[PDB]
Design a protein around this ligand. Structure first.
Ligand SMILES: CO[C@H]1C[C@@H](C)C/C(C)=C/[C@@H](CCOC(=O)NCc2ccccc2)C(=O)C[C@H](O)[C@@H](C)[C@@H](/C(C)=C/[C@@H]2CC[C@@H](O)[C@H](OC)C2)OC(=O)[C@@H]2CCCCN2C(=O)C(=O)[C@]2(O)O[C@H]1[C@@H](OC)C[C@H]2C
Lengths: 107, 107
């Protein structure tokens, strides 16, 4: 499933609803610790519509429990992520992913 | 594909290579003129590495044709951008994108 561990608390009142645009900064790491991606490195937040954007299950469930301003670590089992195939050229088969996510704003 | 039209020239000899980080300022518009994003509004340059599979095809092939210091208009057909899916709620399905880009430096 996904495990959420808070690094910094958010406001505790404003949680993402379906149809809202979540603006996040994330760093993705494999369970071993190799960073494979980061929006923070591109200097550009990832914006997606919760419910409309096709994302791995762990991300959808994990961000849904975060309130605005929270920074959390989501550890996602491969069945909640890219499973058995992985994502060619970026995620290996059967990988557990660790995401450091900050929910910056809901539009 | 990507059409690159010069607004102001670069040095004419330092072109991005695979494995280098392009640092750019840009504004992105849908072809009807609607602005959907800009690094200037975040006041941080956008950075991405060539070959790292982290930007749409139109960025990699467009910037590969620019020299440092160049400012250019890039027109990107949907098949070199978000295609038939778009980026729900930001980029519509089958959108041609127009970017005003300045390649500031390579690192
Ligand atoms: C640098 O790009 C990142 C993603 C966005 C920040 C950028 C973006 C909008 C990319 C589009 C592709 C833009 O490219 C185009 O639209 N190209 C258009 C085109 C294609 C072909 C022909 C013509 C035109 C995309 O893939 C959207 C997708 O929703 C992302 C956010 C999502 C993924 C990869 C979901 C997959 C989707 C497929 C499912 O099967 C799978 O199930 C396991 C889940 O990604 C995710 O679900 C998770 C959670 C959010 C962050 C992204 N993410 C990651 O796992 C990553 O960290 C990752 O590294 O993030 C990049 C992804 O690149 C595809 C790959 C992916 C491993």
């Amino acid at each position: 499933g996904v495990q959420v561990e808070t690094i910094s608390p958010g406001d505790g009142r404003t949680f993402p609803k379906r149809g809202q645009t979540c603006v996040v900064h994330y760093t993705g790491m494999l369970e071993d610790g190799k960073k494979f991606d980061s929006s923070r490195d591109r200097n550009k937040p990832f914006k997606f519509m919760l419910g409309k954007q096709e994302v791995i299950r762990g991300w959808e469930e994990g961000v849904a429990q975060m309130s605005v301003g929270q920074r959390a670590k989501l550890t996602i089992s491969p069945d909640y992520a890219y499973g058995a195939t992985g994502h060619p050229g970026i995620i290996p088969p059967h990988a557990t992913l660790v995401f450091d996510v900050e929910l910056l704003k809901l539009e």
